[PDB]
Write a protein that binds this ligand. Structure first.
Ligand SMILES: [Zn+2]
Ligand SMILES: [Zn+2]
Ligand SMILES: [Zn+2]
Ligand SMILES: [Zn+2]
Ligand SMILES: [Zn+2]
Ligand SMILES: [Zn+2]
Ligand SMILES: [Zn+2]
Ligand SMILES: [Zn+2]
Lengths: 475, 483, 483, 475
């Protein structure tokens, strides 16, 4: 067996000094003074569940093109950053959900760590309604992604979204929402181009924070009417956060996911004099005024935002240059898989903004519970997968594209110092990273099947029935 | 001339004892000890600007039939309750805005008091875009109404609304919005019918307060992006009020209009064992849980809601009964023209919930300023129209359909006691009501023309320009193309 | 050993079917198909950590008399309702904190389950400052209670509270607060008595919800300035909840504790025509308008309120009658120990308002973590104390004073039906309740020692240091003096 | 007579082109095409009610010393800035309110424009309770100022404040409150000095925004329980604003007064390397983080803050230097009388943040209505005092201590450009300023008497009676 020895265990539940013994890809024992044939030195370190990043777009077809990190490079980057599972979005074209799922299975051959998919609902009709049942009950996928923006490509309207959320409620599945008002965005994009305001910074101008706050509020109302929880992906601003807080104060089951980029980077990047510098940071929602960061961090501390992710969608500088002269043609996305946990630890844990237990909650455990795969993932418990990071709080670096795992040529965290990095990362007990030594195993990662109807969905359905309005009896 | 003698003047601006002299339809002199050829005794009374109710649907085609108060009976009802101007909604239809305007001119020939129109944008296209300019610049109408619900009948979507609001901004016009999410409401109606939940109470169940709060918050965002103020008609619940408060706290120019029905009546009317009683109150937004009333009153007192109206859209019981077995066929709407000012005075002024100056502000002056027609309307000032109510704070009645001016057979304020009623109501100096004697003059009312660009619109356009995001000047922009 | 067999384990962390093996007062093994010398049948049952109720006043000197549930009857009542630990408030007095502690040790010798204390800071000075260190470091108590009301009896002011909270921050201890404005309450009590408004309902009138919201918001500001978390006991209204939500939205470490009474009972009890019935419910904060309940439930579901408690402070009817003619002399307090978990399960879990995991979190695990005693308490984990309830979701009763464990003559939950009750309650592995058979062991309970500096306190101190405002380095600082 | 000719009248009520005729210190006629023996050219100008600044401390004894602008220099500065009335705080020592009022009458001999007083309640007891009746009914003063801070000097506690607010309710008077928690401030001051953090910037550190937000909320609750409106002086931060907004959303009668300094200046002044620069800006509440300004401006636009003032309390650099080595010894206060309307116009009206009508509302009319002296003051109506400013929207300057009316040697608005300045200022028809020509008349200003029970106070008392809880009738 392998024993991670001499460290302090940190989970979302508690912190305690103990050794961890791993065999057959599982945690088999946790206690003091354990001995195994192989020992990993965790003295001076924190031993935590491997990160789960539920928001990736590896080898994604988007905006005329394909992201430049694929399943192999994305999962390798994830492991180098202490992350041991990714959840990627399966993205249909009036194409079948089932056809899209087959294509995503094909893309994921070469995965270095385990992985699952969300299924995107990119249009609406009888076929989609029928196939959702198959995806949930037969394919081990209990989340459906909806886009309120990307008019003419991926967007659904209120009527379609309501139908889809009702279906998710019936199936015990969870709708995820990209919340921006697509009609307002499409018009503002056209207005800015018409005015000649066509540079990378005009991407930010085309979709101000109010557009995201409105769309989040609207998705929350539709999910409340449908009787399902709802998850707001990449919550970037106070307006979206306020909508979630206000819904949760009414007892609504609404989850929120700030990206590491939105916690630690800001819109002044778009004002840089160097065109490439500004275009490289174009993503949706855009980096925001720095004033919004404090709201997102408070949400992580108080439990109104539960999950930190990256929306990892990486494009080379050459790809970003597709948008010279027209910001709507710059492929949207920045990468972050490898930098998520290191940034969150240095700027969140070392500063006291979040405890170490909260750091585990928002980097693995909460999402594992939300996707109904805890304690297989997101746990340090006997019987859990041995997806583990041994975190050395003193191991430091300056983040640089010169030393990253990502296949692209820049890094939006370039020049940020982090102190606290993986000493080891294990994926089902396979030591894949030892300090700067990368020893990942292509094809090791396996698809993680998920069941519908977590406790939160079952309770909400019961409460809706208790409170359902009744006909008045008359003569 | 005619002198209104011995009263206390109350406006939104101040309260003072003075006589008011009226000549040629206008206030010509205000001061002590005035005399004229005719005298109206205002001793013990408050002399206020005539009410302006900007939310009426007189002889309106709707839900298979027409509302049963027309311009004559609605303006007569208004005058009897101290209201001297109505603003009605011209409704097209893919029919020209100009053809709808002509139709509404034709409808309004027997009006007893003055009147104007809002133009509804019930569909979107190049013709509508163009005709909006003519409506604003040539036809004296500076407001455009948008319905976010009534799917398949009057509803517009986000894309249409955003186009329309940007055109409002360009023209210096003000968008009005019926804020409920029409797509959710249509699906909830169909679901309730399929379950057999088909009675009048299911109307309320089909459109809960959350769907109004969402739509109000959405219309506000779209107006903020277009750079125009926006006006949320019939704000009925705390969720819609919260959206307005949150937007105004950000400095957004958002107006809200609680109906007198939503201040003083509640959803328990729908739970009555009598089908007719419940159906008579069916309107959209529906009467709400009584808990919401305090929020709306607090908005009047604090300035986050500025206008009290009635959405006067009256149907007889037999018209309501079109919806026996199917609440989606009950014509939606209630009447309140004659009862607005009496209810607000008894339940708001006499209770101390609002001052007399606030009462004037939310029953005439604020809407006059919002519609850019102050001080011609909503004022007691020299040069203002002599639209006046002489209000006797001791004159009392129990409201009843047996005595009402409205042409329909019931009154949603049945049995409410009011103390404080018109002694005289004057429309451009014509005494049309004298203590319960109705002496209205058909066709006396005239269309009130309105100009665009009130101060609020001009200031908001300047602030948008000051804060407009600018391009960054760069050199050596890289090569592009697909390699 | 003893094996709890065939049940479903439910903790705040997860839900799973397994047996639980207990040895020497501790959980020694969790897994399938365990066997031991003794078996408890948990088939069809949920096996959860025993409740922890951190808010009791057992044999407490108060308002001219003493509460009538003592350590024995209160811990017996707790065990009967699935609760296996109480935390009581040691109350000095200018009497030493150490003398009060000895007094409370003496009071607790017959406890049936384990117990700990909070220390109340009822006055301020050098001796208190010093003794706080000894309480934290030597006596195993890491919480200090402060009363913002009970003027002339227990109340401290802003200056005392700020000194005390800074000392809490230094010692890694957590301040608890009874948040009502005592100065306003004292003047309103005197005013109501002077007007002849002297009945039990006037207790509620003397301390309306606004006075709780204000005091909660104030204690939060003082804790934020001292750099320690703060815990708001018996959060009863939306105004106190709003203050907590607003503070947590800023990232402040603020905890809130709704009582089961305030989740499920309301001020209409005070309007009962029977004087005894109304007086029995007199407590501070009083039962509130029922509208406030939804806010508190929503706090449990969303995490802005983390702990359900009872503030168990029981008086007989004849003790309540000390206040006939003068509600300020009705001893304040109600009991709920035995009814907390049964009420919360029927009205929260069975209705879907909270999940079973949330139910565990707000009845044991959150407070265990807040008091820094998890996982010894509030856990089902190997090595944890065997404080367990085996809960039969089908076992039902109507709550009644005729069958209760509490020593007093009535029950504020009289007539409430509950479905879901303990089959077994174990305290450190001792089966003390078996289906309505009470078999408690006096003196079995022991004091639970607690350490300072939970993770939340340490992280908050670090954040305060990272953000501490720094002097600006200047040269040639000017001449001063009076010229 | 004198006719202000060719201008556009702007009041809080409306905007219209008309001439204004003045005779006997009053407006006697308003209309087109007026003629008088004397004409003031208002072509291209806006004709508005003279500003009323209800927050001044002229010749004030405070913190061991006396402010360096007295009634003559303060009222001269006010007129140069378009302001035609000041309301100063009469400040007793267990000294009688009536003795304090006599002293303030004596200080105000040399006033160039009209003036009134608020009476400060600086301690509590039977004498104070008795004298409040005399002040209201016999002395023409309907406001009482309370301090929640200045522990050991001016501070009252909750019990005293509640007693005083009940008395104000009975007398139809309005309590004003300096809202900071004095106990927390006094301790933080001592803690910072003990640490050696004793420079001017530590004044700001000693009283963070949360301390003001708490105190404002607490004053609002006490006034609600007492059944009187309440006015929160110098609302400087979002926390205080939020407390007012939340109270007003419940229907409470709460007024708020942002200073021009808090709308347009910020705490980075305290970080300046020059000791004098930083100390000169020390006042209470301190200049705040610039992020708070947007909240205050929104309040002016939406009606949740009603009155703009200056808290004019001017000290020479020599006086500010009293506090070298101990920030608690720096006299608190900055001046602003002359710069209030010019700053508010350039940064508020010219930017579109407020309309011209709102500018009149928050610079004269609202406070005139709040103090129950409208339309004598704050109006352009026939019969109103001819307190008028003819405002030239094109007349511009850079604000400088070299050209100011204030007797001190610096100006916290130094270097700010303003475009829009008085062409004329009239005080009861006396032209006291013509462009840069100052021609003020010492002793012209007269005390303005005010009556109790404005409409808002009467209505609130009625509503409290309607809602008063009743005894239950029992057998
Ligand atoms: Zn997205
Ligand atoms: Zn994405
Ligand atoms: Zn409508
Ligand atoms: Zn309508
Ligand atoms: Zn208490
Ligand atoms: Zn207690
Ligand atoms: Zn002050
Ligand atoms: Zn002051």
């Amino acid at each position: 067996s392998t024993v991670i020895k001499g460290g302090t265990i940190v989970t979302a539940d508690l912190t305690y000094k103990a050794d961890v013994k791993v065999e057959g890809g599982r945690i088999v024992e946790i206690g003091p003074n354990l001995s195994g044939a192989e020992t990993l030195d965790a003295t001076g370190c924190y031993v935590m569940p491997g990160g789960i990043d539920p928001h990736t777009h590896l080898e994604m077809p988007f905006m005329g093109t394909y992201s430049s990190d694929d399943f192999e490079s994305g999962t390798r980057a994830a492991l180098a950053g202490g992350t041991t599972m990714v959840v990627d979005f399966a993205l249909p074209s009036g194409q079948s959900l089932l056809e899209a799922l087959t294509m995503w299975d094909n893309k994921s051959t070469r995965a270095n760590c385990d992985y699952s998919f969300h299924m995107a609902i990119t249009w609406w009709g009888e076929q989609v309604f029928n196939e959702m049942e198959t995806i949930v009950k037969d394919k081990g996928i209990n989340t459906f992604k909806h886009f309120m923006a990307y008019k003419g490509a991926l967007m659904v309207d209120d009527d379609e979204m309501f139908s889809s959320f009702q279906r998710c409620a019936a199936l015990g599945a969870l709708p995820l929402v990209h919340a921006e008002n697509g009609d307002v965005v499409a018009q503002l994009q056209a207005k800015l181009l018409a005015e000649g305001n066509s540079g990378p910074e005009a991407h930010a101008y085309s979709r101000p924070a109010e557009v995201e706050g409105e769309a989040a509020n609207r998705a929350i109302m539709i999910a409340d009417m449908a009787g399902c929880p709802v998850y707001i992906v990449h919550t970037s601003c106070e307006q979206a956060h306020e909508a979630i807080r206000r819904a949760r104060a009414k007892g609504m089951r609404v989850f929120g996911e700030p990206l590491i980029q939105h916690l630690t980077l800001d819109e002044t990047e778009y004002f840089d004099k160097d065109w490439d510098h500004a275009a490289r940071r174009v993503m949706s929602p855009p980096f925001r005024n720095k004033l919004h960061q404090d709201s997102l961090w408070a949400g992580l501390a108080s439990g109104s935002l539960q999950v930190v992710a990256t929306d990892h969608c990486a494009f080379t500088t050459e790809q970003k240059r597709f948008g010279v002269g027209d910001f709507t043609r710059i492929p949207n996305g920045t990468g972050g898989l490898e930098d998520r946990m290191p940034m969150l630890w240095t700027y969140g844990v070392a500063t006291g903004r979040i405890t170490m237990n909260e750091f585990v909650a928002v980097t693995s455990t909460n999402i594992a519970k939300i996707l109904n795969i805890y304690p297989k993932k997101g746990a340090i418990l006997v019987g859990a997968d041995a997806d583990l990071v041994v975190w050395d709080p003193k191991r430091s670096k300056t983040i640089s594209a010169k030393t990253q795992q990502s296949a692209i040529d820049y890094n939006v965290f370039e020049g940020k110092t982090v102190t606290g990095l993986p000493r080891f990362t294990l994926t089902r007990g396979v030591v894949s990273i030892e300090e700067g030594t990368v020893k990942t195993q292509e094809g090791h990662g396996e698809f993680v099947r998920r069941d519908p109807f977590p406790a939160v969905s079952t309770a909400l359905s019961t409460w809706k029935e208790v409170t359902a309005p009744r006909a008045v009896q008359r003569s």
